Amino acid sequence: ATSSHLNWLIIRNNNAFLLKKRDVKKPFSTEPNNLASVSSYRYSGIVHKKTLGVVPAADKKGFTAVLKKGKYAQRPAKNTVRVDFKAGPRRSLKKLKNLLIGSKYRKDLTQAALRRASAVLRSQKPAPVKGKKA
């Protein structure tokens, strides 16, 4: 059944993206909608429609393309694809995440979501710094 916890005990250890590395107790996965890499039961590949992804850029270094959840209008089994719609914030350094915190009204995932953004734009800032030292 298309049920959220049914997305979880079957993908508790049998995941094919979740590589644990003999040491850190059971963490790591590289799912495209992971965003904080353990498994909450929500930080993961599709939980049925509380999905979140923050993927940079794809066009370096301006944009921060972000999907959202493809909800009730869509089943969301495949769709005439409707699960993602990819809003992209741009044109700010330390303003636009407030637009991003305003973007959302299912408010549990939030603190981790921009926590990628406060370093991933830092991951794609550093060209007018780090430079010459002559």
Partner: protein, 49 residues
């Protein structure tokens, strides 16, 4: 021993499972007496529960 390959059906095929495992209201057809099996937990939500 893992679930889920990406599976593609056809229309004459897809209208045989109702024969091959009947419905919640009936037994099936192409096997004698193979009823559609049971769940042990019939709502399986937790967040909306």
């Amino acid at each position: 021993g893992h679930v889920g390959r990406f599976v593609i059906w056809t229309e004459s095929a897809f209208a045989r499972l109702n024969d091959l495992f009947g419905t919640w209201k009936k037994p099936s057809t192409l096997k004698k007496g193979y009823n559609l099996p049971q769940p042990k937990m019939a709502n399986t939500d937790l967040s909306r529960l």
